[PDB]
Design a protein around this ligand. Structure first.
Ligand code: GDP
Ligand code: MG
Length: 168
């Protein structure tokens, strides 16, 4: 049974926890403590392959965790999430990409740029901005809404496909 070890990163409030729970539990969580970091596991079928997902929902807290360390070290792909109504969160993305490059000592890490909250009308980052940024990195860009499930499987599955390419 293939396992994929994914990590969800991004600024506070972008929806990292909502997207992870929406994937795992198929419901949209209104409020979830911003300082809570946890791992989730679900067996799924991606493209006809049954596999295990093992997902760390980061909170970027400073107290030490040894789980945090192993997933950064052993994690195989990363979701870099910003919100489309949050210009500062899109500006924060570079910091997170550079941190992942450092942990993997590599410019080629499986990674997907996710622009969350696409159910909102007050959009300050347009698709081209985000598409230009993902092309710069050579990684996919996927629009998500944790609230209605739009793109949620696509974001997590596309990353797994990025992991598959790397493993070849
Ligand atoms: N409208 C909308 N709100 C969202 C979406 N995802 C998350 N939120 C809301 O944004 C806030 C932060 O979400 P949370 O999952 O705690 O973000 P985190 O800090 O990245 O873990 C919460 O109030 C969520 O209800 C979304 O797709 N659409
Ligand atoms: Mg959270």
């Amino acid at each position: 049974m293939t396992e994929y070890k994914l990590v969800v990163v991004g600024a506070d409030g972008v929806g990292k926890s909502a997207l992870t729970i929406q994937l795992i539990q198929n419901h949209f969580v209104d409020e979830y403590d911003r300082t809570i970091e946890d791992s989730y596991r679900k067996q799924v079928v991606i493209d006809g392959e049954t596999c295990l997902l093992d997902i760390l929902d980061t909170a970027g807290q400073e107290e030490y965790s040894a789980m945090r360390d192993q997933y950064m070290r052993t994690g195989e792909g990363f979701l870099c999430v910003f919100a489309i109504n949050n210009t500062k969160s899109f500006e924060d993305i570079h910091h997170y990409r550079e941190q992942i490059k450092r942990v993997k000592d590599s410019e080629d890490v499986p990674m997907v740029l996710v622009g969350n909250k696409c159910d909102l009308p007050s959009r300050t980052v347009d698709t081209k901005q985000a598409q230009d940024l993902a092309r710069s990195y050579g990684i996919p860009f996927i629009e998500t809404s944790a609230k209605t499930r739009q793109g949620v499987d696509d974001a997590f599955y596309t990353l797994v496909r990025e992991i598959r390419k790397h493993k070849e």
